[PDB]
Amino acid sequence: MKVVYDDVRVLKDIIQALARLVDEAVLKFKQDSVELVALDRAHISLISVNLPREMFKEYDVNDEFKFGFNTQYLMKILKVAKRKEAIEIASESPDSVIINIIGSTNREFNVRNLEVSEQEIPEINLQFDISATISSDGFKSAISEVSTVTDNVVVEGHEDRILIKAEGESEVEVEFSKDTGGLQDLEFSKESKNSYSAEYLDDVLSLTKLSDYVKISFGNQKPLQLFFNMEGGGKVTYLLAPKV
């Protein structure tokens, strides 16, 4: 198998999130797309990735191929990539995977393919009280700001706005609304306010580099979902357990 993607930084952004969450993970190359699902060690959160074949400059898969890897090590590799540069991932033997960053100097790494333990997760039908599409930069700024004063990020939804604020000290508050310009769309079922771990949200902020907007879904005593649509039909979701 062989895939070529035209911007390694996009994959770096995804792998950067994974490296803060789990020691090892598996990219599953299938006929129509590349898939990944990973739970953090405590099973507090879940990242899911689907990259359709149409995103790729070249895409040659015959048998489904599972590339298991250590997330720290793949980061050691992808950290050499600073620019918009293509990445090739290939394998001609089940035990080896070749990663080629093709910039100024083509740098190739022949890594041992790992057998990583996987689990039934099945499809999750989630219901939420609120969903909204908001600015990814605004969201990143809010989480970075709130995370410097509290461990708990309060997310609250109303009919015309999303507020992100520092739990029990609400002088850190980013508003997403049409007035503020941070709110693109809002679906309202019921008023909601719940807390979520700032640590875990900080872990995945590299995902905000994937799209200008993030769709956020949550509810009272419900998990929080982040969803990023990518050019070419790529999809990435992060699901984070609620605080009670």
Curated annotation (Swiss-Prot):
Highest taxon of source: Archaea
GO molecular function annotations of the record: DNA binding; DNA polymerase processivity factor activity
Pfam families attached to this UniProt entry: PCNA_C (PF02747), PCNA_N (PF00705)
Keyword DNA-binding: yes
GO biological process, alphabetically ordered: leading strand elongation; regulation of DNA replication
Keyword Methyltransferase: no
Keywords: DNA replication, DNA-binding
Binding partners and assembly: Does not individually interact with either of the other PCNA subunits, but is recruited to a PCNA1-PCNA2 heterodimer; does not form homotrimers. Heterotrimer which circularizes head-to-tail (head is at N-terminus, tail is at C-terminus) to form a toroid; DNA passes through its center. Replication factor C (RFC) is required to load the toroid on the DNA. This subunit interacts with DNA ligase, RfcL, XPF, and weakly with DNA polymerase I.
Function comment: One of the sliding clamp subunits that acts as a moving platform for DNA processing. Responsible for tethering the catalytic subunit of DNA polymerase to DNA during high-speed replication. DNA polymerase I, DNA ligase and the flap endonuclease may be constitutively associated with the PCNA heterotrimer forming a scanning complex able to couple DNA synthesis and Okazaki fragment maturation. Heterotrimer stimulates the Holliday junction resolvase Hjc.
Protein family: Belongs to the PCNA family.
PANTHER family for the chain: PROLIFERATING CELL NUCLEAR ANTIGEN
Protein name: DNA polymerase sliding clamp 3
Organism the protein comes from: Saccharolobus solfataricus (strain ATCC 35092 / DSM 1617 / JCM 11322 / P2) (Sulfolobus solfataricus)
Organism lineage: Archaea, Thermoproteota, Thermoprotei, Sulfolobales, Sulfolobaceae
Gene name linked to the record: pcn3
